[PDB]
């Protein structure tokens, strides 16, 4: 099975600009080797990534936001 | 409310995918549960409203304007 | 000289969206054939494309936004 | 006021180029006259405004933060 792959980001913080940008530098790298990519509204101070469920990042933990490069590792870490 | 979007890959159209994609959701926020983006195979471009058809190249014909877009969504909320 | 595009987009009636998009869709197809697209601030109804201040796409004359494959034919005239 | 983004074409910078662009331009609108998408060479990725050094990998190094580039921009308005 393909792996899911999660961005939950903050509505009204207005995060769904870098949520995005993220799917897109996943998709783009991994392309098919992805099941997919979803980009899902949260409340706030919220922005954490999953794979299956899995915690990738996650703001309150991290801190801050992942850097491309950061992100691309870990998920080739699970993949 | 679970919106998909599935898109040929080969055919790099991730780009506009992830454009409506993010035309969605900063229209309906949070009204919608998420905005997948699913890499497919050949020509295919289908978006799925919980399942359900919304759009799909072979169907409707081409790619959608963001105003078709988000009437159809918000058609089914 | 490599051309410069110019997108002027309706700030207010959010199509900064739009625009980035098919800045993108510009560069990702034509890259550094292009010197660059410019992504800039306009008022009311606005939603204009030139290639080195040449008209390529007016809302008010063709009516509506440009598709990705006609936008880029027409880039292609030009170059 | 223009805000230049030099980015280096063959490493895939320009997801990440118009991902700021944006950024900029939802943040500061109008205020803005416009951000440039400059396609550049090996390892480039520059960010200027009216000419004027906002940031550099070389010299800053790495990408910047929508937060840290959000910041700067606004002090030179």
Redesign the interface.
Known sequence: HPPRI?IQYC?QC?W???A??M???L??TF??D????????GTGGVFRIHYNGAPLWDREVDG??P??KVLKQRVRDHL
Do not use: D, K, Y
């Open positions: 999660a509505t207005q769904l600009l870098r995005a940008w799917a897109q530098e998709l783009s392309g098919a992805l099941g997919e990519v979803a980009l899902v509204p801050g936001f850097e491309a």
